[PDB]
């Protein structure tokens, strides 16, 4: 049994976003719209329900840990359910949670060489935190093969590179390298059950679709409904392809890509505050449900039972 807990399902500045009065965010604050609050994206994995591996540490990590009881097993005066942390990139959105875990160092942190480089220079989390009882102990993620974290010995991680787009603070932001962005294949080796996790997904080649058909659950990038959704909402000009996020709709969007996967469970995660699929009455939400695609929400539990 593989447990997947959605601690956060939003992109970005969460939902609602602190400085945003778009139709979704103002509608949620006004109470005029049927949608649920969401913290920034992060999931937790386990093979036994007691030892958990965090994927990305969002700035909302304090409220996310508190909302999920297994994160506090209460086995000592100081304790946590977090046994390791995996990072998929070095973005601020996906890493600042680590600053809120220093009362509990050391932590095993798994990340590639590129991300480790960002996190010792432009955003030197590893350097800052080594001053708290050992800080973060780096475990390198190699760009080929697999790894296993002792705390969950039945989970086999197989990362796959995505389109390198290093963060704006990165010393190598103009010089993208493989290792900047990862998606994760996760296998319960007791059952063959396979999770495909890609919350940041900019494009889909055919090596990727081959991975995805060997998987039972697809937990994928859903930040934007339209590639120019920021412009459509009046909140900015950056495009989906500029951010490395493939929109749901249109030619080559994730919904059309996902029509090739009727076997798999399909879940959209990492959803931006502008996306109409957050409006539970939107026609965009209704179409997503027609296509057999779920919309992740804070608190969602996904149990991976067996292989199809």
Ligand X SMILES: N[C@H](CSc1cc(C[C@H](N)C(=O)O)cc(O)c1O)C(=O)O
Q: Note the residues at the interface with Cl ion (CB under 5 A).
A: 91-92, 167
Residue 200 interacting with a second copy (CB under 8 A): no
Give me 218's structure tokens: 């697809």
Closest CA to 186 of 45, 21, 27: 45
Q: Can residue 174 be called a binding residue for ligand X (CB under 6 A)? A: no
Which token pair is 242? 């500029």
- What is the smallest separation between the CB atom of 30 and a second copy, expressed in angstroms? 9
Nearer to a second copy, 230 or 268 (CB): 230
Q: In what order do the strands lie in the sheet with 82-86?
A: 136-140, 107-111, 82-86, 52-55, 42-46, 2-8, 301-304
Choice between 17 and 46, CB closer to ligand X: 17
* Partner touching 272 among ligand X, a second copy, Zn ion, none, CB below 5 to 8 Å by kind: ligand X
- Asked whether 287 and 278 are in contact (CB, 8 A), the reply is no
CA distances from 19 to 12, 26, 32, 64, 102 (A): 12, 10, 18, 21, 28
Which of residues 9, 117, 170, 273 is near Zn ion by CB under 5 A?
A: 273
Closest by Cα among 177, 167, 237 to 200: 167
Interaction of residue 21 with a second copy, rule CB under 8 A:
yes
Q: Does residue number 275 form part of the binding site for ligand X (CB under 6 A)?
A: no
Omega before residue 75 within 30° of 0, cis: no
With 0-12 / 13-18 / 19 or more C-beta atoms within 10 angstroms meaning exposed / middle / buried, residue 283 is exposed
Rounded to whole angstroms, how far apart are CA atoms 141 and 86? Answer: 9
Site for a second copy in 77-106 (CB under 8 A): 77-80, 92, 96, 99-104
- Binding of a second copy by 234 (CB under 8 A): yes
25 vs 304, which CB is nearer to Zn ion? Answer: 25
103 lies in the binding site for ligand X (CB under 6 A): yes
| Residue closer to Zn ion, measured from CB, 77 or 210 | 77
Nearest approach in angstroms of CB 230 to a second copy is 11
Which residues are near Zn ion by CB under 5 A? 11, 17, 20, 22, 24-25, 93, 273
Which residues are near ligand X by CB under 6 A? 11-13, 17, 91-93, 103, 167-168, 223, 235-236, 243, 272-274
């Amino acid at each position: 049994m593989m447990y997947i807990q959605v601690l956060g399902s939003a992109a970005a500045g969460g939902f609602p976003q602190w400085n945003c009065n778009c139709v979704n965010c103002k509608g949620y604050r006004d109470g005029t719209l049927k949608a649920t609050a969401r913290t920034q994206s992060s999931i937790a994995l386990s093979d036994d329900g007691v030892h958990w591996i965090l994927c990305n540490a969002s700035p909302d990590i304090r409220a996310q840990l508190q909302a999920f009881a297994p994160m506090q097993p209460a086995r000592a005066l100081r304790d946590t359910g977090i046994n390791a942390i995996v990072l998929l990139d070095s973005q601020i959105d996906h890493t600042t949670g680590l600053l809120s875990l220093r009362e509990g160092c050391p932590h095993q942190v798994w990340c590639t060489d590129m991300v480790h480089q960002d996190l010792t220079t432009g955003f030197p989390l590893f350097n800052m935190l080594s001053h708290w009882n050992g800080g973060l102990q780096w475990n390198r993620i190699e760009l080929e093969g697999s790894f296993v974290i002792d705390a969950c010995p039945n989970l086999k991680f197989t990362p796959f590179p995505l389109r390198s787009a290093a963060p704006p603070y990165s010393p190598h932001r103009f010089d993208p390298h493989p290792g900047d962005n990862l998606g994760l294949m996760v296998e319960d080796t007791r059952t063959g059950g396979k999770l495909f996790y890609a919350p940041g997904l900019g494009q889909v080649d055919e090596k990727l679709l081959a991975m995805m058909h060997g998987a039972d659950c697809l937990l994928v990038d859903g930040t934007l409904w339209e590639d120019d959704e920021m412009q459509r909402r009046g909140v900015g000009t950056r495009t989906g392809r500029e951010m490395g996020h493939l929109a749901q709709n249109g030619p080559g969007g994730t919904l059309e890509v996902l029509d090739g996967f009727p076997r798999q469970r399909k879940v959209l995660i990492h959803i931006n505050n502008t996306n109409p699929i957050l409006d539970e009455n939107s026609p965009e939400r209704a179409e997503v449900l027609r296509r057999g695609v779920e919309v992740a929400f804070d608190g969602m539990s996904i149990e991976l039972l067996e292989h199809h």
